[PDB]
């Protein structure tokens, strides 16, 4: 049981890193005046790939 909750904990921090990478990848965007990622969001699909 303790192994179960701890493995749940590592997967939880893993999804935490997922969301952290999402915010970190969108932040350099932060709605730049250029507003273009033809090679990153169209390819890497980090976040809200609906747009670009």
């Amino acid at each position: 049981s303790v192994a179960s909750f701890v493995l749940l904990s590592m997967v939880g921090t893993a999804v935490g890193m997922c969301v952290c990478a999402r915010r970190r990848c969108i932040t350099p965007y932060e709605l730049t005046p250029g507003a273009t990622v033809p090679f990153l969001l169209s390819l890497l699909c980090c976040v809200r790939t609906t747009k670009a």
């Binding site: 169209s42 790939t49 609906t50 747009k51 670009a52």
Partner: protein, 48 residues
């Protein structure tokens, strides 16, 4: 003599290989073509 009972499952023997050869299908290539077309469209297809 009821000892030798055979179910619906049976050994196709050499012909087994034949059906194993027949089982090969072109679904893989058709799926590949669909994926290729949908991506080359993804230039204009984003999330729909």
């Amino acid at each position: 003599a009821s000892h030798t009972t055979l179910g619906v499952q049976d050994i196709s023997t050499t012909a087994m290989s034949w059906v194993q050869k027949i089982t090969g299908g072109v679904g893989l290539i058709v799926a590949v073509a669909a994926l290729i077309l949908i991506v080359v469209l993804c230039v204009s297809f984003s999330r729909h």
